[PDB]
Design a binder for this molecule. Sequence first.
Ligand SMILES: [O-][O-]
Ligand SMILES: [Cu+2]
Ligand SMILES: [Cu+2]
Ligand SMILES: [Cu+2]
Lengths: 273, 73
Amino acid sequence: TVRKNQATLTADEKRRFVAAVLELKRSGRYDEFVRTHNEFIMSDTDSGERTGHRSPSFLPWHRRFLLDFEQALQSVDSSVTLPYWDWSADRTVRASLWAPDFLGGTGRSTDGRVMDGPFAASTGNWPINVRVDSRTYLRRSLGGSVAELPTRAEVESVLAISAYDLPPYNSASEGFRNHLEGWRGVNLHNRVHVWVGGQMATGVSPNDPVFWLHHAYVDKLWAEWQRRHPDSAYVPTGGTPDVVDLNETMKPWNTVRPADLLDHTAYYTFDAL
Amino acid sequence: AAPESFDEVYKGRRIQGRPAGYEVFVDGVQLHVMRNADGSWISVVSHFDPVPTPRAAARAAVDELQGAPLLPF
Ligand SMILES: [O-][O-]
Ligand SMILES: [Cu+2]
Ligand SMILES: [Cu+2]
Ligand SMILES: [Cu+2]
């Protein structure tokens, strides 16, 4: 299983990825990923139980959630793997990611509606069902709410941070995890959600297929951090109320721990690391 | 200490907030909101962009909705 930079996919690989995503949507399986994600967005709190977000398990949790989604895609087409979007490099609306043969572009100005690509509401193939905003079409406003995606220099400043995470292990933390997540500092992952806009700015952000490509690159940055800091590892390592310690199991699966997900090569490799 | 309650018409939508942590409504439909450890707020329709107060989160939700009804959670 090799996870490839989206920019490098062949036309055939793009076609197969899109078709597998559309089939998960048609069959009803896609929307339950969106629902699970929103449940954790709403339940993870700074002062209470926190598992998928704003906590050290943000990274292993999304790594397992993406593995569940990739496995679902492979159950439709076994050749498909999740690509990643390096938003530090492919940083404009003219990027091939946003072309009509891949994810389609930005939303029109009046209502945010995406008007092209395979996920445009006009196709009839991408109903927005799990939603809070009652509108049922994919929406985006690329670069609308924040002017720029993060740069390679900003990403490197975060990869340089030695500590994986720090008490109090929430949105107030110093350390790598919270700077990558983006609640403190120059802001990597949260800012990309804000930059895409539309459903990507919400708790139902997996409604946009770019969600998976964004998180596949956040996941790659975790792998890059590990190679820069082989001496540094996940924390905390036991006994922390409300936080998933290294060897504790994680909801919703309950059968996996951060420890089981630190080494991605158990599951996939990257085109380059 | 919880923020004060509020009630206003913002961009033609009635927004209300009240301590409960804290509940927000847009035309009577409850909107999930959350407080961050540094005292900023977010909502489920603007989760990744902290704003200073629950009223600011309600107003960001009305801006996001562009006139559309909110659905309950
Ligand atoms: O966090 O998506
Ligand atoms: Cu998430
Ligand atoms: Cu709640
Ligand atoms: Cu995310």
